[PDB]
């Protein structure tokens, strides 16, 4: 029978085993996604006005144990400052990676030959790459390049299993000095790629979902 040949019986292991890493939301960002969803988080975007990373973002990154590492592409030259460096992180802070063209070239090399790419970050490869962080997307640039960026990050997740966290500034930034350029200005393709988009607005800091 066709019925017999197509019967599929799965071991329970399949449902709790995974080749991918998932983002652990700090309690500052819980109660936004359901349980299952927060168990399947692979791409997270945060919009926040601060130049330096908010507390939530900092907690999203130091999720490091044992041999695990996070690659931080530090376009803003904040995370990799001498006094800010952490043991759980590898840093890309380079004049070859502060525009979207160089960024895309770097990530393409990371996918093709992670060794060659990570040598650019001064890295011993006795570590699992747990996630990649890019701060700050608002300094990049348009849609074709961002589609390309999203596609490469997605391939990186497929191949290496890392989660992806990115940050951008709110619309205020895009207004420009004295409004001469006139809740973030990223292409909807990129944004549609996200699993969870967080928006931090502030007297006090609230984190809403979009």
């Amino acid at each position: 029978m066709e019925v017999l040949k197509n019967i599929r019986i799965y071991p329970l292991s399949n449902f709790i085993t995974s080749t991918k890493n998932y983002i652990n939301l700090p309690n500052e960002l819980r109660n936004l996604i359901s349980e299952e969803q927060e168990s399947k988080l692979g791409f997270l975007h945060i919009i926040e006005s601060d130049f330096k990373p908010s507390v939530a973002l900092q907690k999203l990154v130091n999720c490091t144990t044992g041999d695990e590492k996070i690659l931080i592409i530090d376009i803003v030259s904040i995370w990799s400052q001498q006094k800010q460096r952490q043991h759980g992180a590898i840093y890309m802070n380079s004049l070859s990676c502060i525009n979207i063209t160089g960024l895309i070239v770097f990530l393409e090399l990371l996918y093709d030959s992670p060794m060659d790419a990570l040598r650019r970050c001064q890295v011993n490869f006795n570590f699992q790459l747990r996630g990649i962080v890019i701060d700050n997307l608002s300094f990049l640039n348009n849609l074709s390049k961002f589609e390309k960026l999203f596609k490469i990050l997605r391939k990186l997740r497929e191949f290496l299993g890392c989660w992806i966290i990115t940050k951008s500034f709110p619309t205020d930034f895009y207004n420009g000095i004295e409004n001469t350029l006139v809740p973030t200005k990223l292409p909807d393709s990129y944004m549609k790629g996200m699993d969870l988009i967080i928006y931090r607005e502030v007297g006090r800091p609230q984190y809403r979902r979009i």
Binding site: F51, I98, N99, F173, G176, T180
Partner: protein, 192 residues
């Protein structure tokens, strides 16, 4: 402020001429390092008379200091970009020719003027992009782990251009001033 305590980009609102002179004096007299000041300004407004009174060129301990101060008048963002190229050349060459420590203080006054001029000669988009590229470049330059040569950037602004800062202490405006925009999106700190 001492060089080793400087952030990658620091805003200094309305420094008095005497305090600027004192800053230069104490930083460029430091021993066992070669400290240089590149003073980039839109007006040629280095307080030379005051500097000569507070740091007389006839005293021997000051000759070194005058040797290591560089003056440039810079009218727009394109020229600032070119100066940044020259500084990167100096730094890169120093690191290469080293493989004694060089410490560069880049001090820029009148950046809002340079921006305004630039965005009369081209689009607001172009000038924002040039400003962005220059400042992000300066941050990466200042952030280099290399010990043999380093740079730190100070931006002078009149305090009236930074009301958002003073308000946070604790008017209707038509967008951020350049100083406020940099304070929010490009500078590590602001020093009174």
């Amino acid at each position: 402020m001492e060089y080793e305590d400087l952030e990658l980009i620091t805003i200094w609102p309305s420094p008095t001429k005497n305090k600027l002179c004192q800053f230069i004096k104490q930083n460029l007299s430091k021993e066992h390092v070669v400290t240089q000041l590149f003073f980039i300004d839109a007006t040629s407004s280095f307080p030379l008379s005051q500097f000569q009174k507070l740091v007389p060129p006839t005293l021997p301990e000051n000759v070194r200091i005058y040797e290591n101060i560089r003056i440039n008048t810079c009218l727009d963002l394109e020229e600032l970009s070119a100066i940044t190229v020259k500084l990167l050349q100096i730094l890169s060459m120093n690191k290469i020719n080293a493989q004694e420590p060089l410490k560069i203080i880049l001090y820029i006054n009148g950046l809002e003027v340079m921006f305004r001029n630039s965005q009369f000669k081209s689009s607001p988009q172009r000038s924002h992009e040039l400003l962005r590229d220059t400042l992000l470049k300066l941050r990466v330059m200042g952030n280099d782990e290399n010990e043999n040569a380093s740079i730190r950037t100070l931006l002078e602004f009149p305090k009236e251009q930074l009301l958002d800062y003073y308000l946070k202490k604790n008017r209707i405006k038509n967008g951020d001033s350049l100083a406020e925009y940099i304070w929010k999106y490009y500078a590590d700190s602001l020093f009174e």
